[PDB]
Amino acid sequence: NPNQQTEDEWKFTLKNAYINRDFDNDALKDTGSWSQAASLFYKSKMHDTPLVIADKPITIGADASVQYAVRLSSDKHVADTVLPFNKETQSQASDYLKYGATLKLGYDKTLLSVGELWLDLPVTAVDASRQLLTSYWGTNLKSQLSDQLYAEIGRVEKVSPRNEEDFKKFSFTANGITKESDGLNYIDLRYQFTPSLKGEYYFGNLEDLYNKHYVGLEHTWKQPTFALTSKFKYFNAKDDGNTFDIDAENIGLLETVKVKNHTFGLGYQQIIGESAYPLPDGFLPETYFINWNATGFFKEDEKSYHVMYGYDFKDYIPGLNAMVKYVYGHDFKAANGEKNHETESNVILNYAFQQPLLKGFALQYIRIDYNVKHGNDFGEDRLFVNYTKKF
Ligand SMILES: CCCCCCCCOCCOCCOCCOCCO
Ligand SMILES: [Ca+2]
Numbered sequence: 082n083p084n085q086q087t088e089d090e091w092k093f094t095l096k097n098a099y100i101n102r103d104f105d106n107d108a109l110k111d112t113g114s115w116s117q118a119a120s121l122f123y124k125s126k127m128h129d130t131p132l133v134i135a136d137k138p139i140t141i142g143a144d145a146s147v148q149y150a151v152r153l154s155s156d157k158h159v160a161d162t163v164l165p166f167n168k169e170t171q172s173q174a175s176d177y178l179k180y181g182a183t184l185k186l187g188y189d190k191t192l193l194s195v196g197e198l199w200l201d202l203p204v205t206a207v208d209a210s211r212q213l214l215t216s217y218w219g220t221n222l223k224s225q226l227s228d229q230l231y232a233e234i235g236r237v238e239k240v241s242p243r244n245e246e247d248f249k250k251f252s253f254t255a256n257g258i259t260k261e262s263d264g265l266n267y268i269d270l271r272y273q274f275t276p277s278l279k280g281e282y283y284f285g286n287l288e289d290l291y292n293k294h295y296v297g298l299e300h301t302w303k304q305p306t307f308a309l310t311s312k313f314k315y316f317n318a319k320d321d322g323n324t325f326d327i328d329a330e331n332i333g334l335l336e337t338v339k340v341k342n343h344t345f346g347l348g349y350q351q352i353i354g355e356s357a358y359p360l361p362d363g364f365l366p367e368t369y370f371i372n373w374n375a376t377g378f379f380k381e382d383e384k385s386y387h388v389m390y391g392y393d394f395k396d397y398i399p400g401l402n403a404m405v406k407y408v409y410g411h412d413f414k415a416a417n418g419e420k421n422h423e424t425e426s427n428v429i430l431n432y433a434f435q436q437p438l439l440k441g442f443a444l445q446y447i448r449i450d451y452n453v454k455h456g457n458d459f460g461e462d463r464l465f466v467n468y469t470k471k472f
């Protein structure tokens with residue numbers, strides 16, 4: 082619950098990150114970097130003030146963060162989407178620094194936060210896919226209004242993307258023209274219908290860009306020998322006032338089964354309307370899609386078919402797991418108006434080291450292969466050496 086932290090929590094991390102996107106076509110330029118980062122995250126316990134109102138204290142705390150990465154590879158003079166890029170000089174940054182702080186005020190099962198926010202929502206999610214992590218600046222209010230109903234409202238004025246140093250306004254870009262928003266006003270509601278069924282409704286008013294509705298329902302069927310996870314997801318995006326002609330729905334179904342150490346998933350997604358499904362500038366991923374991945378399958382009219390196989394190797398090699406995903410998308414058009422289709426495969430290998438000497442170290446390798454009938458084919462490698470210590 083939201084006003085419930087009794088102890089300070091610190092997190093120290095290290096990340097050595099190699100990302101390489103290689104276009105099949107020789108005419109295009111390969112992107113990426115090699116970087117080393119160090120970071121520290123602090124979250125205070127909630128402290129009892131001397132004001133008690135109906136047997137509950139008013140509470141105060143604070144949070145703060147700092148993240149720092151150095152580029153190690155040589156300058157490719159093209160954007161990678163990992164580290165900042167100076168577009169004028171055409172230079173990848175040689176290093177970048179993020180920091181933030183947050184004021185907290187709590188009462189009973191409510192927590193008001195002002196400053197840096199780590200959001201885990203539609204539009205504003207966790208983005209840990211590259212080097213440093215996206216955060217947000219604004220005010221929000223969270224409450225466990227009952228055993229079954231959780232609510233949260235907020236106004237988010239600024240975003241600091243994963244590859245940038247500063248907090249800036251949200252924006253949307255089309256046809257090489259950029260417009261900014263004064264803010265995102267949102268509500269998110271999470272209802273536990275039964276032990277096996279829950280739902281989420283979200284509404285986001287991204288001022289002067291677009292308004293977004295999301296309904297998510299998730300059911301978990303537990304059996305003696307397997308567990309089946311069913312998800313239905315509905316998104317609706319429409320422009321706020323005018324400027325863009327955003328007109329899109331994204332409907333999705335995912336079914337995932339865990340048996341002993343195996344995982345198998347199938348999904349389907351469809352985009353409907355007169356536009357592609359929109360994402361804000363600055364690579365903000367939509368993590369509540371059934372399968373957020375490298376390319377997204379969110380193009381206008383696009384239907385996609387998703388398959389997933391996973392093995393957790395704890396019985397042969399502890400700390401090792403692997404996951405393979407394959408998506409095919411069709412019924413969208415290229416820019417020339419020609420019928421298009423595309424595929425994306427992912428391979429994800431995780432190894433957490435088990436020797437006590439090496440506690441908190443892990444390795445991760447990610448392989449992406451994208452292909453498209455009209456467009457640019459590529460292969461991407463991502464290799465991470467991670468260290469995490471929690472105290
Ligand atoms: C196959 C395409 C269907 C599209 C229709 C959308 C609705 C899907 O909602 C899934 C909800 O399933 C929950 C079933 O209720 C069981 C309640 O819990 C059982 C024991 O507590
Ligand atoms: Ca190449």
Ligand SMILES: [Ca+2]
Binds near residue numbers: 452453455458
């Ligand atoms: Ca191609």
